[PDB]
Design an enzyme around this catalytic site. Structure first.
Site, PDB file in Angstrom:
ATOM      1  N   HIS A  98      -1.190  -1.724  18.077  1.00 49.90           N
ATOM      2  CA  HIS A  98      -2.304  -2.684  18.002  1.00 49.90           C
ATOM      3  C   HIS A  98      -2.346  -3.429  19.322  1.00 49.90           C
ATOM      4  CE1 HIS A  98      -2.589  -2.761  13.272  1.00 49.90           C
ATOM      5  NE2 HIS A  98      -3.068  -1.652  13.803  1.00 49.90           N
ATOM      6  N   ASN A 145      -5.796  -5.740  11.868  1.00 50.35           N
ATOM      7  CA  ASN A 145      -5.955  -4.463  12.612  1.00 50.35           C
ATOM      8  C   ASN A 145      -7.185  -4.641  13.477  1.00 50.35           C
ATOM      9  OD1 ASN A 145      -5.479  -4.235   9.583  1.00 50.35           O
ATOM     10  ND2 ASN A 145      -4.370  -2.401  10.230  1.00 50.35           N
ATOM     11  N   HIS A 160       0.791  -1.223   0.000  1.00 48.71           N
ATOM     12  CA  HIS A 160       0.000   0.000   0.000  1.00 48.71           C
ATOM     13  C   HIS A 160       0.806   1.247   0.000  1.00 48.71           C
ATOM     14  CE1 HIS A 160      -0.333   0.788   4.598  1.00 48.71           C
ATOM     15  NE2 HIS A 160       0.772   0.112   4.331  1.00 48.71           N
TER      16      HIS A 160
END
Ligand SMILES: *Cc1cc2c(cc1C)nc1c(=O)[nH]c(=O)nc-1n2C[C@H](O)[C@H](O)[C@H](O)COP(=O)(O)OP(=O)(O)OC[C@H]1O[C@@H](n2cnc3c(N)ncnc32)[C@H](O)[C@@H]1O
Ligand SMILES: *Cc1cc2c(cc1C)nc1c(=O)[nH]c(=O)nc-1n2C[C@H](O)[C@H](O)[C@H](O)COP(=O)(O)OP(=O)(O)OC[C@H]1O[C@@H](n2cnc3c(N)ncnc32)[C@H](O)[C@@H]1O
EC number: 1.1.3.10
Lengths: 576, 576, 104, 52
Positions: free
Chosen positions: A506, A551, A408
């Site tokens: 996270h 995520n 990405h």
């Protein structure tokens, strides 16, 4: 401000806002407090990337992120500076300096862990990836009935994805996205599947994406108002929530103790229902400051009376990162459908394609963008249009590749030499590992040292567990090296590397969920209700008790939606 | 939005807001447009440092600044990367890449020049220093009558300082501030004077300063409202102003052409009075885009018909910077009034002073802070309290030292090794030189290349002039080296250095003021009215035509206040 | 542990070491100039496959050392330059300079 | 250090790195002229920069 509400919510991140959305909509009288301030413009708690200036200067956004990430625990610095002038003052030791935490072992830290104190929380800057967890990554909501468990997660995730405006097609017209997506599909044919990262976002034009945030879930405007005349909500920014007050029975919360940062005054706030959504670090800090768990350095000789698993079994993901420079084979592929006559820059130069030619590898729309770019910008050597959106590709976690992947672009601070490479060529690779929950991995709070808000200073005692977690982490690195090579070689200065522990933000398991407090070593039940307590609920990633690579936010919101079903079923709203 | 206003203002920085304050207050129907968005919280255009979180984490603020400074002109990058994989795509040339400006000579640039597109402009992040200029740095408002000229600048500066809440005592209780201030006073006794930097700021508590901004000058709320029921103002963010339309006589502006960035639509806006306050770069760009000056690479063979000095005589300050680590002599001085018995950390340890002892070097309040710090924090080796405010010291520009000085702290990104030094010891030094205005130093706009808003791409042709400017710049560096040594030695990693040209963001002279357009080679008169034009006014640092070393904003606001006196005297507000 | 993997480069007529007719080096001899790129096709595919192979093989022993992450070294640092005065059987057919006795 | 002390670069292209933090009093050329033993024949993009 009133003294009495039906529900009080601590934190205005996306999980607090999930509670607010559900409960304000159900007609409860709701207060939300946030220690941070309104600073996203007129749309309270909205994503800071949704300005025209950041959409035209996306790399500057890294600075926004870094400006609101405050390190949780910084060890005492022992770096030697021995080139000071002899006239400068110096201590004879490496004394506790510059906000460092003396409780912290620099070798068992999450140095990259940080928190965001602003209305909307971390959702004012996040990357908006919202994948679902598969069974392997996911806690049970239904025991001994896998299909029933799937069905329940599906119902909840579906609602969560509506609240976040999750979609998988906002990048479908990107050449770069499709170039990467297609190559990787082809290379792993029969082995792995690739798709768009699921993204909480709505495309508004070819050059503007409205990224979602807390504000998407709930707009955070005080109610009653003209659009919601029978609803009741107040948001109080710049209020530090310090403690919930337990009854002597440890069966109910009786008040919330707050500190108003503008007046400086302290108050108690009364509610029927108390919801803590301050993040995985700060929910734990608030609970420990209220006599849950154990304050101070762990001492097994002296186990806590309430919530003994609080702050234990913490998980953070391993993260590996690199950037690539797209291969020549792939760039040339972009213009495979083109006939080219003459030489660029001259009058005879011609780039043409035959719309509908059966031998066309690409759709007409792709070929039109490319022809037009090559004919309009004959000084440019690449066939990719300048405003082509970024790649947003994933292969989701599976048993044979137990990590989440993002292939990405996000905002990045390219050094001078890296700036030498055309941005159209660059792809970011982030692979995220799952961490086994282990009792020995702890977030604890000092009994002597305090943080900037005069609360007990957080301290980590963490290492990535031996065994599966560590083997998979290294196998993940190798997998990124193998997969990335299919697209291009590494970008100098962004070579394959592990990121400092906790940078992925996270963190989970700090106040973990399960069916049974002792048997599942946990703090909240599957309604996110604190064991023993009638009216205390916790939201967020701290609830997640499993080893996950994806995520976590969507999963946390889903649990929050379940938690609000319990609230709606068990507490009556006051009359208006 | 209406089609017709009494006054239109382009830009919502502090200078636009000065116009808005004066003219909305005088009862004009006012529109202000800004290309950037509201993003300072509820107080529109307010300083972003005025959150509790930045006041407790001040170094994080550098990130806010960097996130909203967009480089004006970046040359084509020729850095060689020769460690790519052989499979990665590469061009055979250093082609125009990554938003670089191909018109720009990398050797005659202001590489550090940048602009801020947000409501409130650069005053949402600025350092709030607001010194007055002395005669030598200052343009004439009255000819052949120095006393009358002083009197006029005094009247205007006094009002400007009220609008900004300028003060010189907000740091008077700082130990560090007084330690530096006093030492330098003593060392230059009979040679130079030192004082607090004049700062646009109001202290709210010992640990919180409300820094001023555009919002302090005018709150930017739409009117009529409950507090201003007979006033009329609208702010329209996310509107790119593109051109003012000249009549054929070149005697009046007839409309303002805008682009709405949210709808995408273009409109014309009609007003009696047009005020351009878009910054020194963007006012010039707008004028040149409207047929003032010359578009394209300067061509003397072809002099422009209107405003031929537009974009010429530009000035930017030279800037030198270092940081010091406070001397042992000075730190020991802090605790000179103290008797110390026993050893720190033990029960007998005692730090005492005799309040009122005639031999006390310090006031009792200073000694109380120090005693208390040393007795409360016996593990800390320094006598300076942890929350002691930063130093804010200046010696103002004079003929024998023709530079402005700031001896201070602002937000800074300390590297890992620098983080090893206690922050209480560190002082920043910034000396700012004055630049001779020279016709050859130009800001011009490409006729072919466009920027991110599709406006003519700005290009600099600048070098620091030979002669006085360059001699003084080097003498300034030497002066910082000499002066700084009185306080401590340099901090490794922050050694004495020239900052890249334009980083100081004090650009002036792009649309310079004078009495007579030809004789003073200028664009606006002393009412900031564009020569030839009845109803066009320019505000900002671009107006300043002199060589100045001090921070220019207060001076620009002062000129704006004069400009509004002319407007109030020559244009009637519409009836309400 | 250090890991160094070395790829083989296809000989291509277009890859040249030449000597300036105007510029001289420090001993006043014609200044050497390269016109080199790693050939497309096998050489480049193998080079990238080599990088991947070092990443895969090295992981069997330990993780990378921060500051010494996998990377291509600048062209020619390996100092294994060959073919500048190449050997073959027949000067024209083998495009070469010396025979198998290294005789010109 | 022994190795590096006896490896002399065969062909170094003309350097185009921008230094724009010199003092205004320091001498500077207006171009990136052939400096410091660089080879003006050399394309920096088709070199063996590491050859020595
Ligand atoms: C920062 C980051 C986050 C991130 C991301 C990339 C970046 C750089 N990318 C991710 C993504 O693509 N997908 C995703 O699922 N996660 C990603 N994230 C993380 C994500 O933003 C967080 O998981 C999420 O926001 C968590 O939400 P939650 O509502 O649980 O918590 P929060 O956003 O941190 O908000 C908490 C708030 O509570 C406040 N606070 C803290 N302490 C107090 C006290 N004592 N009293 C009152 N309020 C308190 C905060 O100020 C805050 O707003
Ligand atoms: C960034 C900076 C600024 C600065 C400072 C430190 C930093 C890091 N320290 C200084 C200080 O201590 N003292 C001082 O005197 N100057 C200092 N500054 C500079 C200062 O902030 C500027 O001089 C000041 O803000 C200039 O004010 P002005 O109102 O003239 O201009 P501006 O703030 O740049 O605002 C201009 C606005 O107009 C907009 N814009 C631009 N183009 C358009 C178009 N075409 N259409 C509509 N609007 C336009 C902007 O978006 C902006 O808000």
């Amino acid at each position: 401000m009133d003294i009495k509400y039906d529900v009080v919510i601590v934190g205005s991140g996306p999980i607090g806002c999930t509670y607010a959305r559900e409960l304000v909509g159900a007609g409860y009288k709701v207060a939300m407090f946030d220690i941070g301030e309104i600073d996203s413009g007129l749309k309270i708690g909205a994503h800071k990337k949704n300005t025209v200036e950041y959409q035209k200067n996306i790399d500057k956004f890294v600075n926004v992120i870094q400006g609101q990430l405050m390190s949780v625990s910084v060890p005492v610095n022992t770096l030697v500076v021995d080139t000071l002038s002899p006239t400068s003052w110096q201590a004879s030791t490496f004394f506790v300096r510059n906000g460092s935490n003396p409780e912290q072992d620099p070798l068992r830290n999450l140095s990259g862990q940080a928190v965001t104190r602003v209305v909307g929380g971390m959702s004012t800057h996040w990357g908006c990836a919202t994948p679902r967890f598969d069974r392997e990554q996911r806690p049970l909501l239904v025991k001994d009935d896998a299909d029933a468990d799937d069905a329940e997660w599906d119902r909840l995730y579906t609602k969560a994805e509506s609240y976040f405006q999750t979609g998988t097609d906002q990048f479908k017209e990107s050449i770069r996205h499709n170039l990467v997506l297609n190559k990787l599909t082809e290379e792993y044919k029969g082995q792995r599947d690739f798709q768009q990262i699921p993204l909480a976002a709505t495309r508004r034009s070819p050059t503007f994406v409205e990224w979602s945030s807390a504000n998407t879930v709930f707009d955070l405007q005080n109610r009653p108002n003209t659009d919601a005349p029978e609803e009741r909500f107040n948001l109080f920014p710049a209020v530090a929530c310090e403690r919930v007050v337990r009854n002597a029975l440890n069966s109910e919360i009786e008040s919330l103790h707050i500190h108003d940062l503008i007046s400086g005054d302290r108050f108690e706030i009364k509610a029927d229902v108390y919801v803590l959504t301050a993040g995985a670090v700060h929910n734990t800090q608030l609970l420990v400051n209220s006599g849950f768990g154990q304050l101070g350095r762990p001492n097994p000789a002296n186990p806590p009376e309430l919530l003994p698993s609080l702050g234990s079994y913490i998980t953070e993901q391993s993260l590996v990162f690199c950037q690539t420079v797209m291969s020549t084979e792939l760039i040339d592929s972009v213009k495979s459908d083109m006939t080219i006559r003459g030489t660029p820059g001259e009058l005879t130069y011609s780039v043409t394609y035959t719309p509908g030619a059966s031998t066309n590898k690409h759709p007409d729309w792709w070929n039109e963008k490319v022809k037009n770019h090559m004919m309009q910008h004959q000084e440019d050597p690449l066939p990719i249009p300048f405003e082509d959106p970024e790649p947003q590709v994933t292969t989701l976690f599976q048993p044979s590749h137990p990590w989440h992947t993002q292939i990405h672009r996000d905002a990045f601070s390219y050094g001078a030499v890296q700036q030498s490479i055309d941005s159209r060529l660059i792809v970011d690779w982030r692979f995220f590992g799952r961490t086994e929950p282990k009792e020995e991995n702890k977030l604890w709070f000092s009994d002597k040292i305090t943080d900037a808000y005069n609360m007990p200073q957080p301290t980590f005692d963490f290492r990535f567990p031996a065994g599966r977690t560590s083997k998979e982490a290294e196998d993940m690195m190798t997998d990124m090296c193998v997969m990335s090579a299919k697209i291009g070689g590494f970008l100098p200065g962004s070579l394959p590397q592990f990121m400092k522990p906790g940078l992925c933000l996270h963190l989970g398991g700090t106040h973990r969920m399960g069916f049974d407090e002792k048997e599942d070593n946990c703090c909240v039940n599957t309604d996110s209700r604190v064991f023993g307590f009638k009216n205390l609920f916790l939201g967020g990633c701290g609830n997640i008790p499993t080893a996950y690579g994806a995520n976590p936010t969507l999963t946390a919101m889903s649990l929050a939606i379940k938690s609000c079903e319990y609230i709606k079923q068990n507490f009556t709203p006051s009359p208006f």
